[PDB]
């Protein structure tokens, strides 16, 4: 196991970029103007949190607001996990293009080569660049499970790459499966241009934040972020029974 | 006096970025992957032109496709002019957010500090960043003169900065005035946060291409670009 990382943001000052992360803010990797005087930012906030005093607050829209972690070389799989609290919903949303909260990217400079989880065409799901292909197919658009605004959610994304006949992704909300990609028919536009191994070269950086391709501004808070190459799950506290 | 530049793209090979220019492609300055293999690019094209063999061809959308050039230190005003041919129109367009063809920017790496001329809220006009203000005001949105698709146009933008009480911008189509920013009431949202000197710091680079904030893909061709600190207008051949 090459990575087993957790961050509750408790050690960073309020209004500062999380210590130990990079950023991708307003389309620039490690934007030097990620601060409280800007309209788009990714900063520690002590006004909402799932555990302890602090979370990370993403304020963005069309312009992305993200924190970025470098992943170890040669991962075949990765698990991204966080407590997530959003100003708006994902899923079952008319007129959506696509929006995402979680992802991985191959090149730090670009949003050009990456896998993007949140919603596509108003269903919870995934956009890949550079194909710009989307999952699920048209059939399911503007429907399906909702990730509600204004409440804390335990979101896990499992990405299974490496030496397997078709690369997979499964997303879970409070430990319930909500979205899967496990064959080529799950994509709308012919399956990432025929490519069965569609996570190859994607697993270099992990990112978290807000990025709307539907022209929607949002405020998103996350806490207790985890990144691992072994499965991650949510505890009863996180499930909020 | 400080700049008098022209480019018809005739010396650059087809499918190559225009010689002597930088780029802003896919939100990256001097993107190394500005080439005919990509879905977003700014490349010389000999299949359409206004004069000679060649034009520059911008293919982009929400992801920008632009060529960029430095401007000399000290400019207090600039004129941007080009023959322009576009796959869609600007102006009189319901549902538009904003889209632009011409601009100037302060910092090469970002689209974060710049004046954007094309349409705002479906009326020919201007967006400034970082204020995100727009002109004209809301009374005129989704109306006004059209810059039509599928035909060659001569577009000129005058930007008047430096030591004057209020910075100004005037845009012209085939020598007819189509848009003006003369005073603070021309802005929708309070006038660039009350800054009268709103061109200051903006005249470091000129840029041209296609950049939509309305999620519209386009192809745009330009030729016979001029950039000067002295006025420019369209000649007899350009008016057609
Ligand atoms: Ca915390
Ligand atoms: Ca030419
Ligand atoms: Mg919950
Ligand atoms: Mg845990
Ligand atoms: Mg004409
Ligand atoms: Mg001339």
From TrEMBL, chain B:
Superkingdom as given in the UniProt entry: Bacteria
Cysteines engaged in disulfide bonds, as pairs: 154-234
Binding site for Mg(2+) 2: 226
Residues annotated to bind Mg(2+) 1: 152, 174
Annotated positions binding Ca(2+): 8, 10, 51, 54, 223
Name listed for the protein in its UniProt record: Gluconolactonase domain protein
Organism: Teredinibacter turnerae (strain ATCC 39867 / T7901)
